[PDB]
């Protein structure tokens, strides 16, 4: 996926792996190493007039 | 069964009239929507990811 990775304060339960938004797309994910918790947010975008 | 309205009967006769002797200044409200929230969508960002 493409996005920005930022530090997250979400308290995952030890067994929990993903984090899903309303649209069932991975919002918060756990990296295989360091067992860290991140946020996945789409890059800046918008309309042009 | 819903009460259709308060029952009433006005005394009608062909030589009698009723004329007010006092008045009452009344204020009433009325709410009307004018414009909703302007919205816009992005085609590819929604259909695709
Ligand atoms: C003016 O007089 C008429 C009759 O004298 C009144 O009409 C009657 O009003 C009473 C009120 O309790 C009713 O019970 C009667 O049925 C009415 N008469 C008829 C024939 O229906 C009238 O109400 C009077 N005006 C006012 C403002 O009270
Ligand atoms: C018309 O109605 C008004 C209000 O319903 C009357 O004014 C009232 O008069 C009494 C006695 O003079 C006072 O105690 C109230 O405080 C008044 N009310 C208000 C809101 O000022 C008035 O008297 C009526 N008209 C007539 C000719 O009696
Ligand atoms: C891989 O990462 C884990 C998490 O810190 C660490 O304990 C381990 O030593 C690392 N192993 C290698 C080969 O880098
Ligand atoms: C009013 O109607 C009655 C019948 O209900 C009638 O007798 C009377 O003449 C009428 N009034 C007038 C002024 O004609």
């Amino acid at each position: 996926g493409t996005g920005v990775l930022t530090e997250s304060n979400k308290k995952f339960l030890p067994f929990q792996q993903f984090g899903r938004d309303i649209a069932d797309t991975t919002d918060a994910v756990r990296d295989p190493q360091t067992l860290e918790i991140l946020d996945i947010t789409p890059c800046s975008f918008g309309g042009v007039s | 069964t819903m009460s259709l309205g308060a029952e009433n009967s006005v005394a009608y006769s062909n030589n009698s009239i009723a004329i007010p002797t006092n008045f009452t200044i009344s204020v009433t409200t009325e709410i009307l929507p004018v414009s909703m929230t302007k919205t816009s969508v992005d085609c590819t960002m929604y259909i695709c990811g």
Side-chain angles (χ1 to χ4, degrees), chain A:
Chain A
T2 300
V4 293
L5 308 179
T6 62
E7 197 277 336
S8 77
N9 56 5
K10 295 180 181 180
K11 44 189 67 174
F12 291 167
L13 277 299
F15 69 95
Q16 272 169 342
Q17 289 299 301
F18 307 141
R20 291 281 181 82
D21 53 6
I22 296 93
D24 290 330
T25 65
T26 63
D27 180 76
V29 70
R30 180 194 295 268
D31 49 358
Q33 315 165 8
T34 301
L35 277 298
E36 201 49 47
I37 61 171
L38 306 175
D39 288 329
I40 289 171
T41 307
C43 305
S44 292
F45 78 110
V48 168
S49 286

Side-chain angles (χ1 to χ4, degrees), chain B residues 21-24:
Chain B
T21 65
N22 217 24
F23 50 76
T24 299

Side-chain angles (χ1 to χ4, degrees), chain B residues 4-45:
Chain B
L4 206 55
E7 213 286 331
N8 174 20
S9 176
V10 62
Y12 170 79
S13 89
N14 54 12
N15 71 332
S16 169
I17 201 174
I19 282 186
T21 65
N22 217 24
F23 50 76
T24 299
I25 304 302
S26 163
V27 173
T28 63
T29 59
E30 163 162 312
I31 301 102
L32 285 175
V34 165
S35 63
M36 52 172 161
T37 302
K38 306 159 62 178
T39 187
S40 165
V41 302
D42 191 4
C43 302
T44 63
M45 172 46 38

